[PDB]
Write a protein that binds this ligand. Sequence first.
Ligand code: JRE
Lengths: 267, 346
Amino acid sequence: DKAMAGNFWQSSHYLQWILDKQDLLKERQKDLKFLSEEEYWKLQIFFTNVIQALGEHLKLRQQVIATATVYFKRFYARYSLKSIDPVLMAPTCVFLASKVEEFGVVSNTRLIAAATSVLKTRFSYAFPKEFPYRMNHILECEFYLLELMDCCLIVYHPYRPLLQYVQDMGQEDMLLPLAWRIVNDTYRTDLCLLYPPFMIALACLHVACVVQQKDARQWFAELSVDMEKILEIIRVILKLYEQWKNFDERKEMATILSKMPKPKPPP
Amino acid sequence: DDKMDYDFKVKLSSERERVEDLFEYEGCKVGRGHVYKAKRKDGKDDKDYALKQIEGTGISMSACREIALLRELKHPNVISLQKVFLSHADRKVWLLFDYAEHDLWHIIKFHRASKANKQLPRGMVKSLLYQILDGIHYLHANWVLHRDLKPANILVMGEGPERGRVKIADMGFARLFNSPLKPTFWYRAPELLLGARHYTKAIDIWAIGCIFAELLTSEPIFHCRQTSNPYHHDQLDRIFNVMGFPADKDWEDIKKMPEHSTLMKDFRRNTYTNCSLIKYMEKHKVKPDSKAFHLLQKLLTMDPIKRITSEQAMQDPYFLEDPLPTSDVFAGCQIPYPKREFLTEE
Ligand SMILES: C[C@H](O)c1c(Cl)cncc1-c1cnc2c(c1)CCCN2C(N)=O
Protein backbone atom coordinates (compact mmCIF):
# COMPACT_ATOMS: atom_id res chain seq x y z
CA ASP A 1 0.00 0.00 0.00
CA LYS A 2 1.69 3.20 -1.31
CA ALA A 3 -1.06 5.59 -0.05
CA MET A 4 0.65 8.87 1.09
CA ALA A 5 4.13 7.49 0.13
CA GLY A 6 5.96 10.76 -0.61
CA ASN A 7 4.18 12.90 2.01
CA PHE A 8 6.39 12.21 5.08
CA TRP A 9 7.45 15.87 5.49
CA GLN A 10 3.80 17.05 5.79
CA SER A 11 2.64 13.88 7.60
CA SER A 12 1.19 13.48 11.09
CA HIS A 13 4.06 11.03 11.83
CA TYR A 14 6.64 13.75 11.26
CA LEU A 15 4.73 16.79 12.61
CA GLN A 16 3.29 15.07 15.70
CA TRP A 17 5.02 11.70 16.39
CA ILE A 18 8.75 12.41 16.07
CA LEU A 19 9.34 13.12 19.76
CA ASP A 20 12.04 14.90 21.73
CA LYS A 21 14.27 12.40 23.60
CA GLN A 22 14.16 14.40 26.86
CA ASP A 23 10.33 14.60 26.77
CA LEU A 24 10.34 10.80 26.36
CA LEU A 25 12.70 10.27 29.35
CA LYS A 26 10.72 12.73 31.53
CA GLU A 27 7.43 10.82 31.07
CA ARG A 28 9.27 7.50 31.58
CA GLN A 29 10.37 8.56 35.12
CA LYS A 30 6.97 7.52 36.58
CA ASP A 31 7.54 3.88 35.50
CA LEU A 32 11.22 4.10 36.56
CA LYS A 33 10.05 4.25 40.22
CA PHE A 34 9.17 0.53 39.83
CA LEU A 35 11.55 -0.74 37.12
CA SER A 36 15.20 0.16 36.46
CA GLU A 37 16.17 1.66 33.08
CA GLU A 38 17.60 -1.72 32.07
CA GLU A 39 14.37 -3.49 33.04
CA TYR A 40 12.31 -0.93 31.10
CA TRP A 41 14.25 -1.52 27.85
CA LYS A 42 13.99 -5.29 28.43
CA LEU A 43 10.18 -5.00 28.68
CA GLN A 44 10.20 -3.06 25.37
CA ILE A 45 12.16 -5.87 23.71
CA PHE A 46 9.72 -8.43 25.15
CA PHE A 47 6.57 -6.74 23.80
CA THR A 48 8.21 -6.06 20.41
CA ASN A 49 8.71 -9.84 20.20
CA VAL A 50 5.13 -10.50 21.37
CA ILE A 51 3.78 -8.22 18.61
CA GLN A 52 6.08 -9.87 16.00
CA ALA A 53 4.81 -13.32 17.00
CA LEU A 54 1.13 -12.26 16.89
CA GLY A 55 1.71 -10.77 13.44
CA GLU A 56 3.45 -13.90 12.14
CA HIS A 57 0.66 -16.10 13.48
CA LEU A 58 -1.91 -13.94 11.62
CA LYS A 59 0.28 -13.94 8.45
CA LEU A 60 0.42 -10.13 8.36
CA ARG A 61 3.16 -8.46 6.31
CA GLN A 62 6.17 -6.91 8.09
CA GLN A 63 4.98 -3.34 7.54
CA VAL A 64 1.64 -4.05 9.32
CA ILE A 65 3.54 -5.59 12.25
CA ALA A 66 5.80 -2.49 12.36
CA THR A 67 2.83 -0.10 12.36
CA ALA A 68 1.32 -2.10 15.27
CA THR A 69 4.64 -1.88 17.13
CA VAL A 70 4.73 1.92 16.64
CA TYR A 71 1.16 2.24 18.02
CA PHE A 72 2.25 0.30 21.13
CA LYS A 73 5.32 2.55 21.58
CA ARG A 74 3.35 5.78 21.14
CA PHE A 75 0.88 4.71 23.82
CA TYR A 76 3.50 3.89 26.45
CA ALA A 77 5.61 6.92 25.43
CA ARG A 78 2.81 8.99 27.00
CA TYR A 79 1.29 6.62 29.56
CA SER A 80 2.40 4.34 32.37
CA LEU A 81 2.46 0.56 31.89
CA LYS A 82 -0.20 0.39 34.67
CA SER A 83 -2.76 2.37 32.62
CA ILE A 84 -3.75 -0.46 30.29
CA ASP A 85 -2.31 -3.98 30.55
CA PRO A 86 0.37 -4.32 27.84
CA VAL A 87 -0.88 -7.94 27.26
CA LEU A 88 -4.18 -6.38 26.08
CA MET A 89 -2.60 -3.46 24.22
CA ALA A 90 -0.32 -5.62 22.03
CA PRO A 91 -3.05 -7.59 20.18
CA THR A 92 -5.22 -4.46 20.10
CA CYS A 93 -2.36 -2.67 18.27
CA VAL A 94 -2.05 -5.53 15.75
CA PHE A 95 -5.85 -5.53 15.23
CA LEU A 96 -6.03 -1.79 14.59
CA ALA A 97 -2.97 -1.81 12.30
CA SER A 98 -4.49 -4.64 10.22
CA LYS A 99 -7.65 -2.54 9.65
CA VAL A 100 -5.64 0.31 8.08
CA GLU A 101 -5.02 -2.24 5.25
CA GLU A 102 -7.76 -3.13 2.73
CA PHE A 103 -6.17 -6.40 1.54
CA GLY A 104 -8.01 -8.90 3.77
CA VAL A 105 -9.49 -8.55 7.29
CA VAL A 106 -8.59 -10.06 10.70
CA SER A 107 -11.76 -11.59 12.25
CA ASN A 108 -12.65 -11.47 15.94
CA THR A 109 -12.34 -15.24 16.60
CA ARG A 110 -9.05 -15.27 14.68
CA LEU A 111 -7.57 -12.37 16.68
CA ILE A 112 -8.43 -13.94 20.07
CA ALA A 113 -7.38 -17.44 18.97
CA ALA A 114 -4.07 -15.95 17.79
CA ALA A 115 -3.47 -14.12 21.10
CA THR A 116 -4.34 -17.28 23.06
CA SER A 117 -2.17 -19.59 20.92
CA VAL A 118 0.91 -17.33 20.61
CA LEU A 119 1.13 -16.58 24.35
CA LYS A 120 0.77 -20.24 25.40
CA THR A 121 3.08 -21.81 22.75
CA ARG A 122 5.76 -19.09 22.36
CA PHE A 123 5.60 -17.14 25.69
CA SER A 124 4.71 -19.61 28.49
CA TYR A 125 7.99 -18.62 30.25
CA ALA A 126 6.38 -15.20 30.86
CA PHE A 127 2.67 -16.24 31.06
CA PRO A 128 1.60 -19.33 33.05
CA LYS A 129 -2.10 -18.33 32.75
CA GLU A 130 -4.18 -18.33 29.55
CA PHE A 131 -4.86 -15.08 27.65
CA PRO A 132 -7.69 -13.78 29.85
CA TYR A 133 -9.13 -11.10 27.52
CA ARG A 134 -12.17 -11.45 25.30
CA MET A 135 -13.12 -9.36 22.26
CA ASN A 136 -15.08 -6.67 24.18
CA HIS A 137 -11.82 -5.81 26.00
CA ILE A 138 -9.96 -5.41 22.66
CA LEU A 139 -12.71 -3.11 21.32
CA GLU A 140 -12.63 -0.97 24.48
CA CYS A 141 -8.81 -0.74 24.38
CA GLU A 142 -8.95 0.18 20.66
CA PHE A 143 -10.97 3.33 21.52
CA TYR A 144 -8.33 4.41 24.09
CA LEU A 145 -5.47 3.74 21.62
CA LEU A 146 -7.07 5.69 18.79
CA GLU A 147 -7.76 8.61 21.19
CA LEU A 148 -4.19 8.75 22.55
CA MET A 149 -2.78 8.64 19.03
CA ASP A 150 -5.05 11.58 18.01
CA CYS A 151 -6.28 9.30 15.20
CA CYS A 152 -2.80 9.29 13.56
CA LEU A 153 -2.90 5.90 11.83
CA ILE A 154 -0.57 6.23 8.80
CA VAL A 155 2.97 5.25 9.92
CA TYR A 156 6.09 5.44 7.72
CA HIS A 157 8.87 2.85 8.16
CA PRO A 158 12.50 2.33 6.97
CA TYR A 159 11.67 -0.65 4.69
CA ARG A 160 10.60 1.42 1.66
CA PRO A 161 13.62 3.80 1.59
CA LEU A 162 16.00 0.87 2.43
CA LEU A 163 14.72 -0.94 -0.65
CA GLN A 164 15.39 2.18 -2.75
CA TYR A 165 18.90 2.67 -1.32
CA VAL A 166 20.03 -0.94 -1.97
CA GLN A 167 18.56 -0.90 -5.49
CA ASP A 168 20.51 2.35 -6.02
CA MET A 169 23.73 0.62 -4.78
CA GLY A 170 23.11 -2.31 -7.15
CA GLN A 171 23.60 -4.60 -4.13
CA GLU A 172 20.07 -5.95 -3.44
CA ASP A 173 21.09 -9.64 -3.39
CA MET A 174 24.11 -9.17 -1.10
CA LEU A 175 22.86 -6.54 1.40
CA LEU A 176 19.02 -6.45 1.54
CA PRO A 177 18.32 -9.56 3.65
CA LEU A 178 20.76 -8.42 6.37
CA ALA A 179 19.81 -4.72 6.18
CA TRP A 180 16.07 -5.64 6.37
CA ARG A 181 16.63 -7.89 9.39
CA ILE A 182 18.56 -5.05 11.11
CA VAL A 183 15.63 -2.67 10.40
CA ASN A 184 13.37 -5.21 12.20
CA ASP A 185 15.77 -5.15 15.17
CA THR A 186 15.59 -1.33 15.48
CA TYR A 187 12.00 -1.74 16.75
CA ARG A 188 13.56 -3.22 19.91
CA THR A 189 14.56 0.44 20.66
CA ASP A 190 13.13 4.00 20.72
CA LEU A 191 14.65 4.88 17.31
CA CYS A 192 11.30 4.98 15.47
CA LEU A 193 10.02 7.65 17.90
CA LEU A 194 13.16 9.83 17.48
CA TYR A 195 14.36 9.86 13.83
CA PRO A 196 12.87 9.99 10.32
CA PRO A 197 12.64 6.43 8.84
CA PHE A 198 14.99 7.07 5.89
CA MET A 199 17.77 7.92 8.41
CA ILE A 200 17.10 4.63 10.24
CA ALA A 201 17.26 2.84 6.87
CA LEU A 202 20.64 4.49 6.13
CA ALA A 203 22.05 3.37 9.52
CA CYS A 204 20.88 -0.23 9.09
CA LEU A 205 22.41 -0.26 5.62
CA HIS A 206 25.69 1.06 7.06
CA VAL A 207 25.80 -1.67 9.74
CA ALA A 208 24.98 -4.30 7.08
CA CYS A 209 27.92 -3.04 4.95
CA VAL A 210 30.29 -3.16 7.98
CA VAL A 211 29.15 -6.68 8.96
CA GLN A 212 29.65 -7.96 5.37
CA GLN A 213 32.93 -6.02 4.80
CA LYS A 214 31.49 -4.07 1.85
CA ASP A 215 33.18 -0.71 1.12
CA ALA A 216 30.25 1.71 0.56
CA ARG A 217 32.04 4.87 1.81
CA GLN A 218 31.93 6.69 -1.54
CA TRP A 219 28.21 5.88 -1.92
CA PHE A 220 27.47 7.31 1.55
CA ALA A 221 29.58 10.41 0.68
CA GLU A 222 27.45 10.97 -2.47
CA LEU A 223 24.36 11.49 -0.22
CA SER A 224 23.20 14.85 1.19
CA VAL A 225 22.40 13.86 4.81
CA ASP A 226 23.40 14.76 8.38
CA MET A 227 25.91 11.93 9.07
CA GLU A 228 26.13 12.95 12.75
CA LYS A 229 22.50 11.82 13.17
CA ILE A 230 23.24 8.64 11.19
CA LEU A 231 26.17 7.85 13.51
CA GLU A 232 23.92 8.46 16.56
CA ILE A 233 21.55 5.82 15.12
CA ILE A 234 24.46 3.42 14.34
CA ARG A 235 25.58 3.62 18.01
CA VAL A 236 22.08 2.66 19.24
CA ILE A 237 22.04 -0.31 16.79
CA LEU A 238 25.53 -1.48 17.91
CA LYS A 239 24.42 -1.10 21.57
CA LEU A 240 21.18 -3.03 20.88
CA TYR A 241 23.23 -6.13 19.90
CA GLU A 242 25.33 -5.97 23.08
CA GLN A 243 22.14 -5.62 25.11
CA TRP A 244 20.78 -8.63 23.09
CA LYS A 245 23.86 -10.69 23.98
CA ASN A 246 23.60 -9.97 27.73
CA PHE A 247 19.78 -10.31 27.96
CA ASP A 248 18.08 -13.67 28.53
CA GLU A 249 14.40 -12.78 28.14
CA ARG A 250 13.30 -16.33 28.84
CA LYS A 251 14.97 -16.43 32.25
CA GLU A 252 14.23 -12.78 33.24
CA MET A 253 10.83 -11.62 31.95
CA ALA A 254 8.54 -13.26 34.54
CA THR A 255 10.35 -11.38 37.34
CA ILE A 256 10.50 -8.11 35.36
CA LEU A 257 6.78 -8.34 34.53
CA SER A 258 6.00 -8.82 38.26
CA LYS A 259 7.76 -5.48 39.01
CA MET A 260 5.50 -3.56 36.57
CA PRO A 261 3.24 -1.08 38.36
CA LYS A 262 -0.22 -2.61 38.71
CA PRO A 263 -3.57 -0.87 37.86
CA LYS A 264 -5.43 0.84 40.70
CA PRO A 265 -8.77 -0.99 41.00
CA PRO A 266 -12.09 0.88 41.27
CA PRO A 267 -13.23 1.97 44.79
CA ASP B 1 -12.17 -2.56 31.83
CA ASP B 2 -11.70 -3.88 35.39
CA LYS B 3 -7.95 -4.38 34.73
CA MET B 4 -7.59 -0.77 33.38
CA ASP B 5 -6.23 1.73 35.90
CA TYR B 6 -9.12 3.55 37.57
CA ASP B 7 -7.35 6.93 37.93
CA PHE B 8 -6.27 6.88 34.26
CA LYS B 9 -9.82 5.93 33.27
CA VAL B 10 -11.65 8.70 35.24
CA LYS B 11 -9.12 11.38 34.24
CA LEU B 12 -9.68 10.66 30.51
CA SER B 13 -13.46 10.46 31.02
CA SER B 14 -13.45 13.85 32.83
CA GLU B 15 -11.37 15.47 30.04
CA ARG B 16 -12.94 13.81 26.97
CA GLU B 17 -14.71 16.22 24.61
CA ARG B 18 -18.19 14.87 23.77
CA VAL B 19 -19.86 15.80 20.47
CA GLU B 20 -23.19 16.68 22.18
CA ASP B 21 -21.45 19.14 24.57
CA LEU B 22 -19.65 21.09 21.81
CA PHE B 23 -22.23 21.08 18.99
CA GLU B 24 -25.91 21.69 18.41
CA TYR B 25 -27.04 19.14 15.79
CA GLU B 26 -30.41 17.64 16.90
CA GLY B 27 -33.00 18.33 14.20
CA CYS B 28 -30.25 19.49 11.83
CA LYS B 29 -29.91 16.35 9.68
CA VAL B 30 -29.23 17.28 6.01
CA GLY B 31 -28.16 13.91 4.49
CA ARG B 32 -27.76 10.14 4.98
CA GLY B 33 -25.75 8.17 2.37
CA HIS B 34 -26.12 10.51 9.13
CA VAL B 35 -24.85 13.98 8.08
CA TYR B 36 -25.78 17.06 10.15
CA LYS B 37 -25.39 20.81 9.75
CA ALA B 38 -24.06 21.89 13.14
CA LYS B 39 -23.19 25.09 14.99
CA ARG B 40 -20.80 25.41 17.94
CA LYS B 41 -22.59 25.71 21.31
CA ASP B 42 -20.32 28.38 22.89
CA GLY B 43 -21.07 30.80 20.00
CA LYS B 44 -17.40 31.66 19.37
CA ASP B 45 -17.56 30.92 15.59
CA ASP B 46 -21.12 31.16 14.17
CA LYS B 47 -19.68 29.04 11.30
CA ASP B 48 -21.59 26.00 10.05
CA TYR B 49 -19.99 22.56 10.41
CA ALA B 50 -20.77 19.16 8.89
CA LEU B 51 -20.99 16.36 11.48
CA LYS B 52 -20.91 12.85 10.04
CA GLN B 53 -21.86 10.03 12.39
CA ILE B 54 -20.30 6.91 10.82
CA GLU B 55 -22.73 4.02 10.16
CA GLY B 56 -22.36 0.99 12.44
CA THR B 57 -20.51 0.82 15.76
CA GLY B 58 -16.85 0.56 16.68
CA ILE B 59 -14.18 1.15 14.07
CA SER B 60 -14.71 -0.90 10.92
CA MET B 61 -12.11 -1.34 8.18
CA SER B 62 -13.89 1.36 6.13
CA ALA B 63 -14.03 3.72 9.12
CA CYS B 64 -10.35 3.05 9.97
CA ARG B 65 -9.15 3.82 6.44
CA GLU B 66 -11.32 6.91 6.15
CA ILE B 67 -9.99 8.31 9.42
CA ALA B 68 -6.43 7.22 8.49
CA LEU B 69 -6.34 9.00 5.14
CA LEU B 70 -8.37 12.13 6.03
CA ARG B 71 -6.05 12.66 9.00
CA GLU B 72 -3.14 13.02 6.50
CA LEU B 73 -4.75 14.66 3.43
CA LYS B 74 -4.43 18.46 3.25
CA HIS B 75 -5.31 20.38 0.08
CA PRO B 76 -7.67 23.32 -0.71
CA ASN B 77 -9.89 21.18 -3.03
CA VAL B 78 -10.24 18.10 -0.80
CA ILE B 79 -12.63 18.13 2.16
CA SER B 80 -10.70 18.63 5.39
CA LEU B 81 -11.28 16.62 8.58
CA GLN B 82 -11.30 19.07 11.54
CA LYS B 83 -11.88 16.66 14.45
CA VAL B 84 -12.87 13.09 15.34
CA PHE B 85 -15.14 12.27 18.31
CA LEU B 86 -15.09 8.81 19.86
CA SER B 87 -18.31 8.23 21.82
CA HIS B 88 -17.29 5.62 24.41
CA ALA B 89 -20.75 4.63 25.74
CA ASP B 90 -22.44 3.72 22.42
CA ARG B 91 -19.10 3.18 20.58
CA LYS B 92 -20.11 5.61 17.80
CA VAL B 93 -17.66 7.67 15.77
CA TRP B 94 -18.27 11.28 14.64
CA LEU B 95 -16.27 13.25 12.05
CA LEU B 96 -16.26 17.05 11.97
CA PHE B 97 -15.77 18.94 8.68
CA ASP B 98 -16.24 22.49 7.45
CA TYR B 99 -19.73 22.80 5.99
CA ALA B 100 -20.12 23.04 2.21
CA GLU B 101 -23.48 24.62 1.39
CA HIS B 102 -23.58 23.42 -2.25
CA ASP B 103 -22.67 20.55 -4.53
CA LEU B 104 -22.80 19.71 -8.21
CA TRP B 105 -25.79 17.35 -7.93
CA HIS B 106 -27.94 20.23 -6.62
CA ILE B 107 -26.30 22.92 -8.81
CA ILE B 108 -26.79 20.84 -11.99
CA LYS B 109 -30.34 19.81 -10.90
CA PHE B 110 -31.10 23.56 -10.51
CA HIS B 111 -29.93 24.29 -14.10
CA ARG B 112 -31.71 21.22 -15.55
CA ALA B 113 -34.92 22.44 -13.82
CA SER B 114 -34.38 26.04 -15.03
CA LYS B 115 -34.18 24.75 -18.64
CA ALA B 116 -37.75 23.40 -18.18
CA ASN B 117 -38.92 26.76 -16.74
CA LYS B 118 -38.48 28.52 -20.12
CA GLN B 119 -27.40 27.02 -19.47
CA LEU B 120 -24.65 26.71 -16.84
CA PRO B 121 -22.24 29.75 -16.88
CA ARG B 122 -19.11 28.85 -18.92
CA GLY B 123 -16.54 30.66 -16.71
CA MET B 124 -18.03 28.67 -13.78
CA VAL B 125 -17.86 25.36 -15.69
CA LYS B 126 -14.14 25.82 -16.43
CA SER B 127 -13.30 26.90 -12.87
CA LEU B 128 -15.15 23.93 -11.39
CA LEU B 129 -13.37 21.49 -13.74
CA TYR B 130 -9.98 23.02 -12.91
CA GLN B 131 -10.52 22.63 -9.16
CA ILE B 132 -11.89 19.09 -9.49
CA LEU B 133 -8.70 18.22 -11.46
CA ASP B 134 -6.45 19.97 -8.93
CA GLY B 135 -7.95 18.02 -5.99
CA ILE B 136 -7.92 14.69 -7.84
CA HIS B 137 -4.32 15.35 -8.95
CA TYR B 138 -3.35 15.79 -5.28
CA LEU B 139 -5.07 12.54 -4.27
CA HIS B 140 -3.52 10.66 -7.22
CA ALA B 141 -0.01 12.07 -6.54
CA ASN B 142 -0.42 10.54 -3.05
CA TRP B 143 -1.68 7.23 -4.55
CA VAL B 144 -5.20 7.78 -3.19
CA LEU B 145 -7.98 6.89 -5.61
CA HIS B 146 -11.54 8.30 -5.16
CA ARG B 147 -13.20 5.21 -6.70
CA ASP B 148 -16.74 6.72 -6.68
CA LEU B 149 -16.61 10.16 -8.38
CA LYS B 150 -20.00 11.73 -9.19
CA PRO B 151 -21.60 15.23 -8.95
CA ALA B 152 -22.94 14.58 -5.40
CA ASN B 153 -19.29 14.22 -4.23
CA ILE B 154 -18.06 17.53 -5.70
CA LEU B 155 -19.00 20.00 -2.96
CA VAL B 156 -18.88 23.77 -3.40
CA MET B 157 -18.42 26.16 -0.50
CA GLY B 158 -20.97 28.91 0.10
CA GLU B 159 -20.70 32.39 1.62
CA GLY B 160 -17.64 32.61 3.89
CA PRO B 161 -13.84 32.75 3.50
CA GLU B 162 -13.72 29.91 0.90
CA ARG B 163 -16.62 31.20 -1.26
CA GLY B 164 -17.06 29.06 -4.38
CA ARG B 165 -14.17 26.66 -3.71
CA VAL B 166 -14.58 23.04 -4.77
CA LYS B 167 -14.21 20.39 -2.07
CA ILE B 168 -13.96 16.75 -3.22
CA ALA B 169 -15.71 14.55 -0.64
CA ASP B 170 -16.88 11.01 0.13
CA MET B 171 -13.90 9.12 -1.33
CA GLY B 172 -14.33 5.30 -1.52
CA PHE B 173 -11.69 4.81 1.20
CA ALA B 174 -12.15 1.03 1.59
CA ARG B 175 -12.58 -1.45 -1.24
CA LEU B 176 -11.53 -5.04 -0.43
CA PHE B 177 -8.32 -5.85 -2.40
CA ASN B 178 -8.83 -2.52 -4.27
CA SER B 179 -11.50 -4.48 -6.23
CA PRO B 180 -14.75 -3.32 -7.97
CA LEU B 181 -15.92 -6.97 -8.02
CA LYS B 182 -16.36 -7.07 -4.19
CA PRO B 183 -19.53 -5.72 -2.47
CA THR B 184 -25.87 4.71 -10.48
CA PHE B 185 -23.55 3.33 -13.22
CA TRP B 186 -23.53 6.63 -15.18
CA TYR B 187 -19.99 7.70 -14.19
CA ARG B 188 -18.35 4.23 -14.47
CA ALA B 189 -15.57 3.77 -17.03
CA PRO B 190 -16.10 1.13 -19.75
CA GLU B 191 -13.26 -1.07 -18.39
CA LEU B 192 -15.25 -1.44 -15.13
CA LEU B 193 -18.31 -2.53 -17.12
CA LEU B 194 -16.10 -5.07 -18.98
CA GLY B 195 -14.88 -6.59 -15.68
CA ALA B 196 -11.75 -4.66 -14.64
CA ARG B 197 -10.47 -6.26 -11.42
CA HIS B 198 -8.98 -3.10 -9.83
CA TYR B 199 -9.64 0.63 -9.42
CA THR B 200 -7.14 2.90 -11.24
CA LYS B 201 -6.36 6.61 -11.64
CA ALA B 202 -7.78 6.35 -15.20
CA ILE B 203 -11.18 5.23 -13.76
CA ASP B 204 -11.37 8.49 -11.75
CA ILE B 205 -10.51 10.59 -14.83
CA TRP B 206 -13.35 9.07 -16.91
CA ALA B 207 -15.75 10.11 -14.12
CA ILE B 208 -14.39 13.69 -14.31
CA GLY B 209 -14.99 13.52 -18.09
CA CYS B 210 -18.61 12.55 -17.34
CA ILE B 211 -19.04 15.37 -14.80
CA PHE B 212 -17.55 17.91 -17.28
CA ALA B 213 -20.01 16.85 -20.02
CA GLU B 214 -22.86 17.14 -17.52
CA LEU B 215 -21.76 20.69 -16.52
CA LEU B 216 -21.62 21.71 -20.19
CA THR B 217 -25.08 20.26 -21.12
CA SER B 218 -26.97 19.85 -17.76
CA GLU B 219 -27.66 16.17 -18.69
CA PRO B 220 -25.77 13.08 -17.51
CA ILE B 221 -23.96 12.15 -20.75
CA PHE B 222 -24.33 8.39 -20.15
CA HIS B 223 -27.78 8.50 -18.53
CA CYS B 224 -29.41 5.07 -18.37
CA ARG B 225 -32.19 3.43 -16.30
CA GLN B 226 -31.37 1.52 -13.07
CA THR B 227 -26.02 -7.18 -8.73
CA SER B 228 -22.58 -8.74 -8.11
CA ASN B 229 -21.52 -8.92 -11.79
CA PRO B 230 -19.69 -5.91 -13.32
CA TYR B 231 -21.26 -6.35 -16.80
CA HIS B 232 -24.16 -3.94 -17.37
CA HIS B 233 -25.55 -4.21 -20.90
CA ASP B 234 -27.79 -1.13 -20.99
CA GLN B 235 -25.06 1.17 -19.61
CA LEU B 236 -22.64 -0.06 -22.31
CA ASP B 237 -25.32 0.39 -25.00
CA ARG B 238 -25.69 4.02 -23.82
CA ILE B 239 -21.93 4.62 -23.90
CA PHE B 240 -21.77 3.35 -27.51
CA ASN B 241 -24.87 5.37 -28.56
CA VAL B 242 -22.95 8.49 -27.45
CA MET B 243 -19.33 7.55 -28.24
CA GLY B 244 -19.59 5.04 -31.13
CA PHE B 245 -18.35 1.44 -30.84
CA PRO B 246 -14.56 1.32 -30.28
CA ALA B 247 -12.45 0.20 -33.25
CA ASP B 248 -9.72 -2.40 -32.61
CA LYS B 249 -7.06 0.33 -32.98
CA ASP B 250 -8.84 2.59 -30.39
CA TRP B 251 -8.56 -0.04 -27.64
CA GLU B 252 -6.23 -2.95 -28.56
CA ASP B 253 -6.34 -4.60 -25.10
CA ILE B 254 -10.20 -4.74 -25.08
CA LYS B 255 -9.77 -8.43 -26.04
CA LYS B 256 -8.11 -9.03 -22.64
CA MET B 257 -11.08 -7.66 -20.66
CA PRO B 258 -12.89 -10.51 -18.84
CA GLU B 259 -16.27 -9.64 -20.41
CA HIS B 260 -14.97 -9.13 -23.99
CA SER B 261 -16.64 -12.27 -25.36
CA THR B 262 -19.95 -11.26 -23.77
CA LEU B 263 -19.53 -7.85 -25.46
CA MET B 264 -19.00 -9.56 -28.83
CA LYS B 265 -22.01 -11.83 -28.22
CA ASP B 266 -24.40 -8.98 -27.31
CA PHE B 267 -23.15 -6.09 -29.52
CA ARG B 268 -22.48 -5.30 -33.17
CA ARG B 269 -20.24 -2.42 -34.38
CA ASN B 270 -22.73 -1.75 -37.20
CA THR B 271 -25.39 -0.63 -34.67
CA TYR B 272 -23.43 2.53 -33.75
CA THR B 273 -21.97 3.70 -37.12
CA ASN B 274 -23.74 7.11 -36.99
CA CYS B 275 -22.67 7.66 -33.32
CA SER B 276 -19.80 9.89 -32.04
CA LEU B 277 -19.01 12.31 -29.20
CA ILE B 278 -18.80 15.06 -31.85
CA LYS B 279 -22.40 14.41 -32.94
CA TYR B 280 -23.66 14.11 -29.35
CA MET B 281 -22.02 17.34 -28.12
CA GLU B 282 -23.12 19.33 -31.23
CA LYS B 283 -26.79 18.55 -30.50
CA HIS B 284 -26.17 20.14 -27.03
CA LYS B 285 -24.67 23.39 -28.45
CA VAL B 286 -20.99 22.58 -27.71
CA LYS B 287 -18.79 23.20 -30.78
CA PRO B 288 -16.39 20.34 -31.76
CA ASP B 289 -13.61 22.86 -32.58
CA SER B 290 -13.83 24.33 -29.04
CA LYS B 291 -10.93 23.78 -26.64
CA ALA B 292 -13.56 22.59 -24.14
CA PHE B 293 -14.55 19.75 -26.49
CA HIS B 294 -11.02 18.58 -27.31
CA LEU B 295 -10.21 18.29 -23.58
CA LEU B 296 -13.57 16.55 -22.93
CA GLN B 297 -12.70 14.01 -25.63
CA LYS B 298 -9.28 13.33 -24.06
CA LEU B 299 -10.98 12.67 -20.67
CA LEU B 300 -13.62 10.41 -22.26
CA THR B 301 -11.15 8.20 -24.08
CA MET B 302 -12.39 4.61 -24.03
CA ASP B 303 -9.05 2.80 -23.72
CA PRO B 304 -7.89 3.64 -20.16
CA ILE B 305 -4.16 3.65 -21.14
CA LYS B 306 -5.00 6.34 -23.76
CA ARG B 307 -6.87 8.53 -21.24
CA ILE B 308 -5.22 11.85 -20.28
CA THR B 309 -3.97 12.10 -16.65
CA SER B 310 -5.19 14.75 -14.18
CA GLU B 311 -1.88 16.65 -14.37
CA GLN B 312 -1.96 16.79 -18.20
CA ALA B 313 -5.61 17.92 -18.15
CA MET B 314 -4.62 20.84 -15.86
CA GLN B 315 -2.03 21.87 -18.50
CA ASP B 316 -4.67 21.91 -21.27
CA PRO B 317 -4.78 25.14 -23.35
CA TYR B 318 -8.51 25.31 -22.40
CA PHE B 319 -7.43 26.72 -19.01
CA LEU B 320 -5.29 29.43 -20.71
CA GLU B 321 -8.12 30.52 -23.06
CA ASP B 322 -10.34 33.45 -21.97
CA PRO B 323 -12.01 33.36 -19.43
CA LEU B 324 -9.38 32.19 -16.93
CA PRO B 325 -10.53 29.84 -14.15
CA THR B 326 -11.23 31.64 -10.85
CA SER B 327 -10.69 30.61 -7.23
CA ASP B 328 -14.35 31.40 -6.43
CA VAL B 329 -16.25 29.44 -9.14
CA PHE B 330 -19.11 32.00 -8.81
CA ALA B 331 -16.61 34.80 -9.66
CA GLY B 332 -17.98 37.20 -7.01
CA CYS B 333 -21.55 36.96 -8.43
CA GLN B 334 -24.65 36.31 -6.32
CA ILE B 335 -25.31 32.63 -5.56
CA PRO B 336 -28.81 31.65 -6.86
CA TYR B 337 -28.66 28.02 -5.64
CA PRO B 338 -30.86 27.26 -2.63
CA LYS B 339 -29.38 26.15 0.70
CA ARG B 340 -29.87 22.57 1.95
CA GLU B 341 -33.13 22.01 3.86
CA PHE B 342 -33.13 20.27 7.25
CA LEU B 343 -34.86 16.86 7.10
CA THR B 344 -37.63 16.05 9.64
CA GLU B 345 -38.56 12.55 8.28
CA GLU B 346 -38.72 9.47 10.54
C1 JRE C 1 -20.48 14.70 4.72
C2 JRE C 1 -20.58 15.40 3.36
O1 JRE C 1 -19.51 14.93 2.53
C3 JRE C 1 -20.53 16.92 3.50
C4 JRE C 1 -19.41 17.56 4.07
CL1 JRE C 1 -17.99 16.75 4.68
C5 JRE C 1 -19.42 18.95 4.17
N1 JRE C 1 -20.43 19.69 3.74
C6 JRE C 1 -21.49 19.14 3.20
C7 JRE C 1 -21.60 17.75 3.06
C8 JRE C 1 -22.84 17.25 2.40
C9 JRE C 1 -24.11 17.28 2.97
N2 JRE C 1 -25.16 16.82 2.29
C10 JRE C 1 -25.09 16.33 1.04
C11 JRE C 1 -23.85 16.29 0.43
C12 JRE C 1 -22.72 16.77 1.10
C13 JRE C 1 -23.67 15.77 -0.97
C14 JRE C 1 -24.97 15.88 -1.75
C15 JRE C 1 -26.07 15.17 -0.95
N3 JRE C 1 -26.25 15.84 0.36
C16 JRE C 1 -27.51 15.91 0.88
N4 JRE C 1 -27.81 16.48 2.08
O2 JRE C 1 -28.44 15.45 0.25
